[PDB]
Amino acid sequence: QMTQSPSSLSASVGDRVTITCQSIKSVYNNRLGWYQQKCGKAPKLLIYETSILTSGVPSRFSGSGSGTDFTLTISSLQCEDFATYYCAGGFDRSGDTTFGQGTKVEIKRTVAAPSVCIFPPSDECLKSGTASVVCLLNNFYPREAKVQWKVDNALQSGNSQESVTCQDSKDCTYSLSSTLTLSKADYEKHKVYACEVTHQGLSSPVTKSFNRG
């Protein structure tokens, strides 16, 4: 119900960034708070009553504003500050309270090439009908990465899933997991299984392969 600006932003480590929170009604008794939510985690109260820092929150965070216009400032942006930030306001004591729409914060860093691991299917899960080969791209930036699957150097499609972690709170990198799903018969038919990774940190695509057996 409260407007936040921008919807998402990006900056570099050490930059100063600002998130604005606007409301139609005026805030009652300075009841305006700023929460930070990291991936897969509950929101954490950073600022309460417009400008008071929660104990333990680094002094890099600060809050300002009044009435209908408020501001959260991160003076020295860090990799651990990757999160979605919300503002929450109360306009009376009868139940007029609401959150802001949120603002995503990404951090820019230098290019980092991934490390490629490959995992053959376990014989315990080969007892069912599905075999799953797992390719892992560890600690890379930027996010854009291409993962190609090869079975006896035959190129696969439509039989693979993938997910990416969020920006690591220490080195600003990402990690991707790709899973190739075949039937156990097709798995026992072929031997060479490879994943070819294309990322701008690599001068050439890096292929990790294993032979079934």
Place this chain on the structure above:
Amino acid sequence: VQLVESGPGCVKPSETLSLTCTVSRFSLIGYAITWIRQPPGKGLEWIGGISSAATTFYSSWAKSRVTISVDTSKNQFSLKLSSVTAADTAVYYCARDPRGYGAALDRLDLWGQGTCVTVSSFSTKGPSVCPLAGTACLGCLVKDYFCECPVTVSWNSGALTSGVHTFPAVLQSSGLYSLSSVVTVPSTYICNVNHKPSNTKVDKKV
């Protein structure tokens, strides 16, 4: 002091969803407890609240289908949502206001980790845990389960923390979910997987 959340995990439409928020350990005297929910890929939405004097407030949309109460003998706050549809699928949080305000969102200083609620007609299925074997990767694959969460993946019962990346679950063409957790270690490793909706508790060693 923690706000332990408990829920059924997956429910079918038209059912009544019942969630509990238990205060583990004693802390402040007059604290209030509010319920927020977060739909997938969306923002925070205030459901309701209950103050230090048990005064219960409901958001405009929740007045006709949410009941919030307290059991003081258990230190257990209860939220009931009636006639649920797929639009009620969300992660539900309880949070504490240290001032005792039952209708304030500006100072929630302690949150529960949240409980997942998926409203669908599809059946619950338990996952299979597949091991995956100067520094090398290893991990575990939690495969073919529904609904998505509550799902927990720990390493060495919490001892292994550094280098551990637990990936977001993906929805496969089989209609089930697959999650993968990996740890990179210098060249005993056991992953503890807990899927509450199917009561699947498996410790697999890699």
